[PDB]
Enzyme design. Sequence first.
Site, short mmCIF file in Angstrom:
data_model
loop_
_atom_site.label_atom_id
_atom_site.label_comp_id
_atom_site.label_asym_id
_atom_site.label_seq_id
_atom_site.Cartn_x
_atom_site.Cartn_y
_atom_site.Cartn_z
N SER A 190 8.38 -10.35 -8.37
CA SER A 190 9.33 -10.29 -7.27
C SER A 190 10.08 -11.61 -7.17
CB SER A 190 8.57 -10.00 -5.98
OG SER A 190 9.42 -10.07 -4.85
N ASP B 289 -3.55 6.59 -9.02
CA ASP B 289 -3.78 5.15 -8.95
C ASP B 289 -3.10 4.43 -10.10
OD1 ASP B 289 -4.72 2.63 -8.53
OD2 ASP B 289 -6.80 3.04 -9.14
C1 LIG Z 1 -12.15 6.38 -1.86
N1 LIG Z 1 -12.22 4.98 -2.22
C2 LIG Z 1 -13.51 4.34 -2.01
C3 LIG Z 1 -11.28 4.42 -3.11
C4 LIG Z 1 -10.26 5.18 -3.66
C5 LIG Z 1 -9.39 4.55 -4.53
C6 LIG Z 1 -9.55 3.20 -4.82
C7 LIG Z 1 -8.63 2.50 -5.76
O1 LIG Z 1 -7.71 3.25 -6.29
O2 LIG Z 1 -8.75 1.30 -6.00
C8 LIG Z 1 -10.60 2.54 -4.22
N2 LIG Z 1 -11.47 3.12 -3.38
#
Ligand SMILES: CN(C)c1ccc(C(=O)O)cn1
Length: 330
Positions: free
Chosen positions: A199, A35
Amino acid sequence: STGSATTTPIDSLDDAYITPVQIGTPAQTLNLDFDTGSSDLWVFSSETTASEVDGQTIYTPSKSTTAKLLSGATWSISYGDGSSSSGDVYTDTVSVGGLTVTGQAVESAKKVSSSFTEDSTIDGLLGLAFSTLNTVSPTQQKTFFDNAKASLDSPVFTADLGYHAPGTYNFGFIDTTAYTGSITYTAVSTKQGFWEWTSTGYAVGSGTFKSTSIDGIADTGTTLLYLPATVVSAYWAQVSGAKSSSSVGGYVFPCSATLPSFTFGVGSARIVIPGDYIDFGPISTGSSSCFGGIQSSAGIGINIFGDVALKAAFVVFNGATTPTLGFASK
Ligand SMILES: CN(C)c1ccc(C(=O)O)cn1
């Protein structure tokens, strides 16, 4: 050093991508959601409330000879989709695609929200935004990338996400065989802790390019492309029967439609998102109303170049002293 790991969609819609990560000694392999919009490496664990675990692989620090409790440290995070998690912290050895960091903060979940429990395929998150966003208290911790950076051949990582297919995260090198043409680099602001960039505009389908500055973040942990309401309205106006549905929570369109492409500017360069990438399928099983992959950022406070956009490109996250982003077609 370098690392290279394959990242795999969790489902047929590319709702998220998981990448195997080795934690501890002997290795415990968990599939984490990388992420670039957050900065905590957290995992389902032997400490996670039992009723909140449903199929995930857990990290058990007591089985790792290299795990050490980071005494007094706690963490708690909330994400843009309203999900959340919290717990305590260990340090341990973490490896991604052959790249090893010792003493990485591994945040062990005691609690996770329902959307995490319900996703059996995601065993935790590996944050790749700037360490200033890390939530560990009272001593903030570094991301995997920050910890690895000095050892890397080049202080970079790259995201090459697939459309309905596996892709790759590389650390420490740029694979010049993974993209076409040249990489266009663009300035980053780290003021909000994100890979935030501007962008240079957009086009819908075969339409003329609109030159306009759109500030937003490159966020691998967000599924969709969230842009200003003006831009999003211009896109969906080209799809017969498309509309914004307050009940569904965004733009929907007839599943019988053929979607136009969407182009975004990176400096003078252009990245084209094929129409198919913008289809997120029936809103509910068997429905002929389909959910759109381009949605308004108006409720959010920031524009988000999520997976829909990033998967159309080879993306360089350059963590040099002055960070930059690079985009190439592929
Ligand atoms: C699995 N779920 C509920 C997730 C996974 C990742 C994210 C995020 O990176 O913002 C958010 N929700």
